[PDB]
A paper describes a structure:
This homodimer exhibits (i) a very important surface interaction, (ii) a high number of intermolecular hydrogen bonds and salt bridges. The monomer of OPHC2 is roughly globular with overall dimensions of approximately 44 Å×50 Å×37 Å. The superposition of OPHC2 with MPH and AiiA yields RMSD values for α-carbon atoms of 0.74 Å (over 213 residues) and 2.41 Å (over 105 residues), respectively. The catalytic center is composed of two metals bridging an activated water molecule as observed in MPH and AiiA structures, but also other esterases such as SsoPox or SisLac. The higher thermal stability of OPHC2, as compared to its closest known homologue MPH, may stem from a high dimer interface area and an intramolecular disulfide bridge.
Here we provide the structural and enzymatic characterization of the recently identified enzyme isolated from Pseudomonas pseudoalcaligenes dubbed OPHC2.
Numbering used by the authors:
A (entry chain A), B (entry chain A): 25 to 167, 211 to 324
Amino acid sequence: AAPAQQKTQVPGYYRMALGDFEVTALYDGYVDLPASLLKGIDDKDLQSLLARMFVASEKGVQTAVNAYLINTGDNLVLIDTGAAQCFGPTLGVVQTNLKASGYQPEQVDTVLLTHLHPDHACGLVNADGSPAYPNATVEVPQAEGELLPGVSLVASPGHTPGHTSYLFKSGGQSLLVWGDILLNHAVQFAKPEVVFEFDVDSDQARQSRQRILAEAATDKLWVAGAHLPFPGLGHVRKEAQGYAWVPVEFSPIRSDR
Amino acid sequence: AAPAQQKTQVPGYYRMALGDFEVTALYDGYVDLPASLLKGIDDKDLQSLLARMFVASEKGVQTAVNAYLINTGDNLVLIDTGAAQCFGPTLGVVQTNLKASGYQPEQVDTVLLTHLHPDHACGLVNADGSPAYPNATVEVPQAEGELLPGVSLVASPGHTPGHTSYLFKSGGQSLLVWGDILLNHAVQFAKPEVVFEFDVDSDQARQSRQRILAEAATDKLWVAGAHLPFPGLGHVRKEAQGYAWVPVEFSPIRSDR
Ligand SMILES: [Zn+2]
Ligand SMILES: [Zn+2]
Ligand SMILES: [Zn+2]
Ligand SMILES: [Zn+2]
């Protein structure tokens, strides 16, 4: 006698203030990744780490893919673009969420890619072959502020040779849109030594991860992570061993802050 | 040259499957609570606990107020109703989010109150004096399933004498909509001994909290918490000392699960 269930999820966007900038986190969808792709750890310990965060793995680890839209006043900047249809119908929702968040793709004047992997770059092209962001300058990493006012490059090579993170600064606040520094929040904060099979260079990716985590924890900066649980926004805390992820708490943007 | 900032936040609803039931978490807004209202802990340790979770306290702890709408197939059930205008304009958004989530208040056939505090009960009445949920049977705690199919009472006295939690079970899964078992996730999971000044009976509230946390951790049940960071959904994990909150990871409702 209840009405039919609605099913539908809330739209995959989330707003956060960062000084005078506005951050809109955008969800692309998810992909199931086998836990066996994580290496450098015993099966038992891996499963314990997953169970600790109540992450199911029997049918693979459901992994989020996020992109970030930052309105700096000077520019509307999109970092990564999701996967379009490259990895199937559970992904490709970034542009839809961009629209849901109150912007249009024609407004994006800059697209920054952390790296060229499908789940970051395929979203540049619509199903009919038309450019998803037709008015944007697209920045591809090489295998005021600096790049733009308030926006600078933070090299983070390893996952791919040209893998790059982007730093946004406004009003004393900093946000690092870090790309694929890590793929599994339940394992690689606690044990950054753990690597991903599809890191092009796993040793290097691991070195960059250790460094970036140390810096993020030390400087208490905000992090925006392509494969962290959506909205993928939060801080890194140093633990006795390894690190912990602290996600932002849902909040409207406050005028009195 | 960027467009104007949108400001607006994504609507405050979140969908989760629980067996054959559908859970819609609903955000009422927030209230700033002084950290001085938490007792049983030194100032220093309290501040350390807050800083650990990156919770600002200089202007009070911004605290979420959540309600929960569960479609059990048999009933559309709302647990708590937010504050309406009882605590000012930063609250009172539950009904708005209920509408945003695709339901209408006329559809709610049952309202369960965890307790009679303003931030749970004031939402029963619209600004013009009309009933917010005019077709609902309202269950006030006394100072199949059992109450309804799949729905049972879990007494949790202390915060108020009649304070009550509600258990929903479907398809082997359980969700406890627990009310005000705790008020600050950054302090009272790690240190359940810490009490709230406006618990009517702080010793009793603390006993109920210890018991409920132990049970939630042991039985691995889902928890829906009125003052946990929205959507307020997740699990409780037992630590060497005290407990930890593990929030659900954003996900659509999956057909293949
Ligand atoms: Zn990648
Ligand atoms: Zn990726
Ligand atoms: Zn209360
Ligand atoms: Zn309350």
